[PDB]
């Protein structure tokens, strides 16, 4: 959780650094800085991060999420049935 | 009587693999298996043991030509086969049933694999005829044995992706277990409640 | 996805493997993937990390006042600490007797 | 005071323990549980402080056999001479899948705690639980078992150790939450190492991007728990079974063979009325299950509690980070 | 003589307490504060007044039931023993509830549901599980008697689950502890008749051992038999209305059978063509856009020649139960076909299964404090 | 006693048994009936066989849908010509059509209507009615394709979760007794280590 | 209540004063039976929906149609709804409850 919080923290101190790269060409002139450097690297990050964008993807990913779901789900089942038989034994 | 037994009990062991509770036919059958897989070294097949031991292991892997060669070698022709009075009716019958169950164990352990088959490359690779094959299948699909349907105007059987994953697998063979555990504990509370059952049922049914 | 695709304990090829989406894939990609983009290039985190920097000479500059006092008090706790926590463990295994002998006076 | 019961206070495992402990990391004792290491420490302020350990290695082969003592006896005298004394407080077995503590390990802290009281027993954990929660687990033993001390055996004080019903789920310490003071030199060398050479940072921070993407670890985790915690389920079942039968079914035809006597024979015994309930072995609470076992009921409700948590936050971020 | 002697002492002796009731409630407080304090349990304070609930409508159902003219049962009670309890001021604690649904009962017999609304706007107080299963019992009967299958259909499953998680224990629902048990199962059962190929939501509401014969109820129901209208009408009825206690039965009284000719016939029209609206539906709707081929197909299916097959097609479309549309030029006959849902259960299970996992681990852990 | 009879001294009865299971009016009986009939030819077909025996043994042995299409019209000409089954001839083949269809519509799920208007000498149109008249009568999920002539079966494939819920049906049900029946337990433990004296005080006004 | 709106005009007895005494009764039915058509139908031909409200001549289906909005469209029907807005599926679009479920299984 503190691996999840400082996730997000680092989207948005690149949130941060994407305007100053932005914001370089937005007064005067700049954004070398991000005009084939980082417009590299983001396309890479985008081609990871999510993946492409069908809407296939998107039920494809639910599809993984309500197997997961539904493995995480008969975790807490099985904490149910590891009680129910220790419980049992010791009435 | 050991390849009656190996007829019987690779096809049952391919389909239950999964199962937690493995129903062993022939105990005569899984002692000589487990001797021959005891042996660190286990050399070309000499014995009439271990030639129905060496097509046992083929037979579960589906190759019915190894198969075959074990079972239908000189060696056991002149030690076995040529001791029947129609040595070639007992022969084709038996290349038959290796054939045909065969595919059947193939099917079982490879059903996993496939999303769908063609009757035509299953009647090429088994060298069966295609009404056989289809009654097989359809055989097979009626016995809930194979997650599958089949297409009647393309020839095709296609698979159903239900089949559960190995920690699906770890979850039902431990759901069964769990219910046998609640069956037995069933079972102890009645012998409980039944008390110390000792000084209540003497005062109603005359 | 699984490992069925993959070869499931061991490829026998030269690595290639498109992408794929499986577990805290997009969970940690984003959280390391979105950080190297503001730690290679950046303006605005060296600033900050010099300023870390700051704080760290400031914790060792704490820490050289405090290792001086730690050089008399833990210098006190060591050498006693021989003595008293074995005397402590002493009594501890020195009681299986205590246990013995008193015992073996009432019967 | 958050201090334990009755001769010891909590653990503060100090960072350059932890340090030692993953240089012998989940080697020399991968698939065999293999006690890595003694915890060397002193008393603090509401805590041990656990300030070094030294490893104890064995003939680690593929199997573990206990060696001479020679190495221990030289190695607590070689840390002595430089630094402090034998002050072992615990010991650290790393080692073999996601924390569990097995009923050897209860037996060999028995003889442990019983003999200094002043002790935890820690369960290394890394990446082999998915990493995952509860990396240090300190865990101490009941003083109630030690002071019903040896020994519970099948039948006598199996019942009665029992019936007194000393924890089995009983509470582990937390092991940080503060400065420890000694912080101070590895504190310095982070401005050095990040930034300006964030080389071994980088490198051990992008460790989670392959945490994820590859080879089956979700999948492998409820795999091996699919077997590890099946096998445990089926003999507490299986146990649970013979010894009801003893407990009732048998009874059941035995007193209705008590009928069939009338339950008196004036002249002469009463040989075959005297002579039924003659022991099985359980008569009730079997008891290596029902608190060595039941502690390990724990070690896999937190197993699947831990399995499961990693899971939760990609059924967040994937849905999410798509979302967008 | 014995069979009186103990109604008239029940009725005589509530008569008594209506007047301690409405005395203690409004004004007294040291009387009340002096109630609080002296036994262990408050549980004799409360469970007196819906006691006499279910005690007085049986009472009160034998002497509407004997007498049948020149009415003295039913205007004493809805005047004086009724609203003299409930219209002013409730006493505090859960006894405000109980009055309430006490009340709420009582208007349920009598076939005057339209304060439905304002009922629910006086339970200001908390829903405690105890005064909320009792609460849809009757609101989901409300919506059953409102043509709203759908809805009620939903209210009747969670009051059957048996993890709304009821614990009793102390006898709060005492002696009829499976009429909670039949008559939700039954009063859904006239439910899935009506509109079901929706739910995929009966999974939940009731057990195998029952679905397997109401199951096949339905389908032999709308399908090929009136017989099914019997069994269910004769089962249903006990558990409509809700008539605690039917009088002696012996034909040198009659007394008692006048009474039941309203009470069944009122009901007699509810299931009559509610029923006949289900075989509609009960053919699959195979295509959902249907041509010449399966328009034709289904009105071959629904009546034959000749006379007056498009008209009665297009009547029973109206209902609630069709939506489509005609076209001229093409003839054509398009429709619509939905569908319900898969898995509700599992995410509902997830909170229920924890339950079994908690009290599990409660209850040890009350027998952990014993032993130890 | 009668099915011995029949399998020892007159195995020919089967033709008769066979023709009454088919043309029987309750098509919940005929089909329960239908599986001890199968065994019983099964066990018969090496000392009687006939174009009727075999029509049931080719469906539901074989599954040879075409072998039982021949041996039907060969039971056409059976039936004319049999004094006791005259009268059953259009009961038969009418029956006979209706399981050679509900038996391939359980194992294909595409079905041609051409094939089918072939089979049952039907016009295409008369097929796909006779068909919507199957599918209502059995209860089969099926879309008819009147477009492409294709009879499409639903997927009853019984999801796994609920082969999971019918099997722990039983057992959800016996833990809720065994909770309840411990709870009562309990409850009547705790109840009577109430100490006696409570009741004593309320005997002075 | 069958929705038998043909039967219904054709059941009246006209010599029931009784009926022709209640105000606003005579359109209230009709305001009902085109109530029913907007909830499930697409369109209505015009002599179909003429002789649901009692065999209607041209000029007294004008307040029919201009009712509702509805008007004629080619060959000859009159529009009553939009074919997706008469239909309105809620089906099977669950399984997006994870927030809450991931609120309880928070710890």
Partial sequence: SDLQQVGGASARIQDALSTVLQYAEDVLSGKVSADNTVGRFLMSLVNQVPKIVPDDFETMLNSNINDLLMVTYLANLTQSQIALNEKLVNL | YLVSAMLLEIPYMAAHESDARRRMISKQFHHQLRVGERQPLLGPPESMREHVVAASKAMKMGDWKTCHSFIINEKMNGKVWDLFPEADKVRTMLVRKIQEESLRTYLFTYSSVYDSISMETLSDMFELDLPTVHSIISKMIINEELMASLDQPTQTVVMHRTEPTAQQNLALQLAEKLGSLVENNERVFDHKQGTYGGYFRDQKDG | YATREDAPIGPHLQSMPSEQIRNQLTAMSSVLAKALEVIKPAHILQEKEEQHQLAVTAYLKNSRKEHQRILARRQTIEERKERLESLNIQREKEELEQREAELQKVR | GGSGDSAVKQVQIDGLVVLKIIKHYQEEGQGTEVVQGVLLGLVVEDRLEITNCFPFPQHTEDDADFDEV?????????????????????????????????????????????????????????????????????????????????????????????????????????????????????????????????????????????????????????????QDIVKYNTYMRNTSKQQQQKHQYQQRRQQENMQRQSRGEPPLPEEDLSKLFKPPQPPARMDSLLIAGQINTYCQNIKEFTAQNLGKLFMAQALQEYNN | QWLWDIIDEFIYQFQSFSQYRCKTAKKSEEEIDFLRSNPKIWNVHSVLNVLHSLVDKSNINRQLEVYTSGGDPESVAGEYGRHSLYKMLGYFSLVGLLRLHSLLGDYYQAIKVLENIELNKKSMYSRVPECQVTTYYYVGFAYLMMRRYQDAIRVFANILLYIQRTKSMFQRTTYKYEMINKQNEQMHALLAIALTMYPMRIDESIHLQLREKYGDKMLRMQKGDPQVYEELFSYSCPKFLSPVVPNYDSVHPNYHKEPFLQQLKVFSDEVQQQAQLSTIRSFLKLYTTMPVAKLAGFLDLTEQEFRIQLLVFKHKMKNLVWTSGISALDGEFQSASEVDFYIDKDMIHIADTKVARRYGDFFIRQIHKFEE | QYLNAIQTMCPHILRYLTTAVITNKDVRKRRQVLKDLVKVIQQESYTYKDPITEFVECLYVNFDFDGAQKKLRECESVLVNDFFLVACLEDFIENARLFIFETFCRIHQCISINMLADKLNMTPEEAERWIVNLIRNARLDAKIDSKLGHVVMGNNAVSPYQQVIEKTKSLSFRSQMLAMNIEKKLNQNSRSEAPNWATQDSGFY | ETCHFQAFWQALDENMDLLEGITGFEDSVRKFICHVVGITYQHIDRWLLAEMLGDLTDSQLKMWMSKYGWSADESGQIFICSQEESIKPKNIVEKIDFDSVSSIMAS
């Fill in chain 4, 70 to 226: 020679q190495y221990q006896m030289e190695m607590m005298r070689s840390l002595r001479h430089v630094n402090i004394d034998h002050l072992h407080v615990g010991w650290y077995q790393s080692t073999y899948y996601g924390s569990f503590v097995t009923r050897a390990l209860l037996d060999s802290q028995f003889s442990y705690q019983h003999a200094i009281e002043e002790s935890v027993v820690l369960i290394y954990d890394p990446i082999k639980t998915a990493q995952g929660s509860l990396s240090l687990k300190a865990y101490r033993l009941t003083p109630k078992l030690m002071e019903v001390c040896k020994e519970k055996d099948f039948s006598p004080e199996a019942l009665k150790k029992a019936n007194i019903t000393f924890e089995h789920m009983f509470e582990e310490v937390p092991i940080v939450i503060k400065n420890s003071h000694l912080i101070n030199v590895l504190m310095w060398e982070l401005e050095k190492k990040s930034a300006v050479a964030d080389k071994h940072e980088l490198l051990s921070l992008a460790s989670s991007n392959h945490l994820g993407k590859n080879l089956q670890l979700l999948m492998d985790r409820v795999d091996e728990m699919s």
